From Swiss-Prot, chain B:
First-to-last residue of the parent protein present: 25 to 53 of 110
Name of the protein in its database record: Insulin B chain
Consequence of changing residue 10 to D: In HPRI; Providence
Source species of the chain: Homo sapiens
Effect recorded for residue 24 to S: In HPRI; Los-Angeles
Length: 21, 29
């Protein structure tokens, strides 16, 4: 999930926006 | 500022900044 994608590995804007409303 | 390891409040802050009025869900699991 987001932690595995952005904390444990390097985040991206692409991935963050997956979590926007 | 998004292209790095972001944990905890730093991740939340990034979601905030990026999503703006759209809001966001944070589910650390």
């Amino acid at each position: 999930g987001i932690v595995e994608q952005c904390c444990t590995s390097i985040c991206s804007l692409y991935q963050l926006e997956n979590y926007c409303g | 500022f998004v292209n790095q390891h972001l944990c905890g409040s730093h991740l939340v802050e990034a979601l905030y900044l990026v999503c703006g009025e759209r809001g966001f869900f944070y589910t650390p699991k």
